[PDB]
């Protein structure tokens, strides 16, 4: 009930779309993944790639994490991704988010789960 791995999947995985819908993707998705139940999580990124493609990042380019840990890996190639971030005018429990679609190299922290 919630392992670090399922938390990760619940929060960032969206293999059901190749890219962000439209301007409301962050509103529905943040909602769906229950990232706004108690509060409005302020920032969250969705990866539009298959689970396996993302797990495979842990055997890609090893880099330091933004903290100094050594368990961070960078994807060799770019990935379709969606940046969800709270708009200056967002208050609980009516959380508004600005969806920003992009194609980027993701950096993930890995552990044996």
């Amino acid at each position: 009930k919630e392992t670090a791995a399922a938390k990760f999947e619940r929060q960032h995985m969206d293999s059901s779309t190749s890219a962000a819908s439209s301007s409301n993707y962050c509103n529905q998705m943040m909602k769906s993944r229950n990232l706004t139940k108690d509060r409005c999580k302020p920032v969250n990124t969705f990866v539009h790639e298959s689970l396996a493609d993302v797990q495979a990042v842990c055997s890609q380019k090893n880099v330091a994490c933004k903290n100094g840990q050594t368990n961070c890996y960078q994807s060799y190639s770019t990935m379709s991704i969606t940046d969800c971030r709270e708009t200056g005018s967002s208050k609980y429990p009516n959380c508004a988010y600005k969806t920003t679609q992009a194609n980027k190299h993701i950096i993930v922290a890995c552990e044996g789960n």
């Binding site: 791995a5 990760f8 960032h12 990042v57 890995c110 044996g112």
Partner: peptide, 11 residues
């Protein structure tokens, strides 16, 4: 099998 546990950054 080391799996992603945190989404650190983009690019």
């Amino acid at each position: 099998p080391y799996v992603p546990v945190h989404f650190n950054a983009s690019v």
